[PDB]
Design a protein around this nucleic acid. Structure first.
Length: 74
DNA sequence: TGGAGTACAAGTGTGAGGAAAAGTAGTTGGCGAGTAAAGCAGT
């Protein structure tokens, strides 16, 4: 319900839904072949809030823009 | 021959810890000179 929805999205989600598309396609890429392509600054997991939108940034509140960049690693 | 359970191995009930950017403080600092006349005191 839109009344107090509290949607559960994190940067751990956008890798997890990117891992499941790899096993339905039956790919040899894994979470060792994801954490080696994100912590080596290859696909934009880290620092995503700050450089990606460039026009949609400013009206987003402070705790929401905190979650969308690559804050920690999982 | 057949049970007391006591063990590890399965479960589900009970609130909180850590994350962080903008926004918000107490605090300095850095401003806007004459020639004349009449008056009523004066004595």
């Amino acid at each position: 319900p839109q009344e107090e929805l509290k949607l559960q999205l994190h940067m751990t989600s956008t890798i997890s839904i990117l891992y499941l598309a790899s096993t339905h396609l039956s790919l040899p890429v894994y979470t060792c072949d994801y954490i080696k392509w994100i912590c080596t600054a290859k696909m934009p997991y880290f620092q995503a809030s700050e450089i990606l939108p460039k026009s949609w940034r400013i009206q987003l509140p402070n705790y929401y823009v905190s979650i969308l960049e690559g804050s920690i690693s999982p």
